Scaffold this active site. Structure first.
Site, PDB file in Angstrom:
ATOM      1  N   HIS A   1     -18.751   6.139 -36.685  1.00 57.89           N
ATOM      2  CA  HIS A   1     -17.698   6.981 -37.233  1.00 57.89           C
ATOM      3  C   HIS A   1     -16.282   6.473 -36.980  1.00 57.89           C
ATOM      4  O   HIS A   1     -16.004   5.740 -36.029  1.00 57.89           O
ATOM      5  CB  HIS A   1     -17.837   8.484 -36.817  1.00 57.89           C
ATOM      6  CG  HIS A   1     -17.120   8.876 -35.548  1.00 57.89           C
ATOM      7  ND1 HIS A   1     -15.729   8.944 -35.481  1.00 57.89           N
ATOM      8  CD2 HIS A   1     -17.629   9.267 -34.351  1.00 57.89           C
ATOM      9  CE1 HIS A   1     -15.449   9.309 -34.242  1.00 57.89           C
ATOM     10  NE2 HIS A   1     -16.557   9.504 -33.521  1.00 57.89           N
ATOM     11  N   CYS A   2     -15.381   6.897 -37.848  1.00 59.55           N
ATOM     12  CA  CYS A   2     -13.950   6.685 -37.736  1.00 59.55           C
ATOM     13  C   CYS A   2     -13.203   8.080 -37.860  1.00 59.55           C
ATOM     14  O   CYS A   2     -13.801   9.113 -37.536  1.00 59.55           O
ATOM     15  CB  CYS A   2     -13.444   5.626 -38.717  1.00 59.55           C
ATOM     16  SG  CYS A   2     -14.278   5.612 -40.324  1.00 59.55           S
ATOM     17  N   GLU A   3     -11.915   8.098 -38.246  1.00 55.53           N
ATOM     18  CA  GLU A   3     -11.103   9.324 -38.360  1.00 55.53           C
ATOM     19  C   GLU A   3     -11.583  10.232 -39.498  1.00 55.53           C
ATOM     20  O   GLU A   3     -11.832  11.418 -39.256  1.00 55.53           O
ATOM     21  CB  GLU A   3      -9.610   8.951 -38.518  1.00 55.53           C
ATOM     22  CG  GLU A   3      -8.571  10.012 -38.192  1.00 55.53           C
ATOM     23  CD  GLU A   3      -7.160   9.648 -38.634  1.00 55.53           C
ATOM     24  OE1 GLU A   3      -6.986   8.616 -39.326  1.00 55.53           O
ATOM     25  OE2 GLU A   3      -6.230  10.429 -38.340  1.00 55.53           O
TER      26      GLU A   3
ATOM     27  N   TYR B   1     -14.330  12.095 -37.587  1.00 57.67           N
ATOM     28  CA  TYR B   1     -13.969  13.029 -36.542  1.00 57.67           C
ATOM     29  C   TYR B   1     -13.194  14.219 -37.109  1.00 57.67           C
ATOM     30  O   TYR B   1     -13.334  15.337 -36.607  1.00 57.67           O
ATOM     31  CB  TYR B   1     -13.225  12.300 -35.416  1.00 57.67           C
ATOM     32  CG  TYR B   1     -12.973  13.163 -34.201  1.00 57.67           C
ATOM     33  CD1 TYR B   1     -13.951  13.337 -33.231  1.00 57.67           C
ATOM     34  CD2 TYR B   1     -11.752  13.803 -34.020  1.00 57.67           C
ATOM     35  CE1 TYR B   1     -13.725  14.137 -32.113  1.00 57.67           C
ATOM     36  CE2 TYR B   1     -11.515  14.614 -32.909  1.00 57.67           C
ATOM     37  CZ  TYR B   1     -12.503  14.774 -31.953  1.00 57.67           C
ATOM     38  OH  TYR B   1     -12.252  15.544 -30.841  1.00 57.67           O
TER      39      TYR B   1
END
EC number: 3.1.3.48
Lengths: 167, 167
Positions: free
Chosen positions: B97-99, B135
């Site tokens: 995952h990232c932002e 996130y």
């Protein structure tokens, strides 16, 4: 996929990609641009339509956005008395949004209703856009353009949420 | 699009749709499920890999997530000494995952590296997932599963951002 609903023109807003290919998506940057008066002489009137429920809308919305979350409300705002531009060379645009189901169906609804009132391919609203990622993606990037400067997530019967903010 | 990288099995996690069709996307609910021990006897080990920069990671991350944001770090964690399950009937999974660019390329990197080390179609890591919306979509839905219970957006040279939280 660049001409407006009545095929007369091309899209005024730099459009981007999204879930459904039939809809013409936009990004926080362009909404931010619109708000600062970046399109005067090209776009006469513009509407940001927050399709969320009032509690979500009151908990933080794009400055100047209207809270129209039902079909009847949307028909009474836009189609009962269609908005016509003073300068016909300039356009009237509508940017719809939700939190991040209910949002694209409003865009579809307005368009289905507009088509049934006109003789094809004419429309009172040929330019309809959807803000990609909704308020969840705009708020973090342009807080100073939000009112209040908070974010109220949707309430879920199954899982608890609460108002996000900072200092 | 349900078999794992080595074609031996089917996906263990309820997968959903996303941007690239070659990648196998997941949602906050399943990550929440994984964390509570919902897959013991099926999945032996699992890793949430936060590809964001440390400052974003330290400002709020999924509980237990590892901050691996470079290719070298990722190779040294997973491929220098491959993780092998104690019970071979059970699996080892990785959720990236990232932002909400850098995130799917890490998934691709690990896989390209894993393929070059093996004789096709064998892999040390056949099960790779991406958390849809990152996130930004998990935090609002599962704050109690985040550590600290905050969200630090990515810093942009062009536009100011800041830490989101509540009480």
């Amino acid at each position: 996929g660049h001409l407006i609903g009545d095929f007369s023109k091309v899209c005024a807003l730099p459009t981007v990609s999204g879930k459904h290919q039939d809809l013409k998506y936009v990004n926080p940057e362009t909404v931010a641009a619109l708000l600062s008066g970046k399109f005067q002489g090209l776009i006469e009137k513009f509407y940001v339509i927050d399709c969320r429920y009032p509690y979500e809308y009151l908990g933080g919305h794009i400055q100047g956005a209207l809270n129209l979350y039902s079909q009847e409300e949307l028909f009474n705002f836009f189609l009962k008395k269609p908005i016509v531009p003073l300068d016909t060379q300039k356009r009237i645009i509508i940017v719809f949004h939700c939190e991040f189901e209910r949002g694209p169906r409003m865009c579809r609804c307005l368009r289905e209703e507009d088509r049934s009132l006109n003789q094809y391919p004419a429309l009172y609203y040929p330019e309809l856009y959807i803000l990609k990622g909704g308020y969840r993606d705009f708020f973090p990037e342009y807080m100073e353009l939000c009112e209040p400067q908070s974010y109220c997530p949707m309430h879920h019967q199954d899982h608890k949420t609460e108002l996000l903010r900072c200092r």
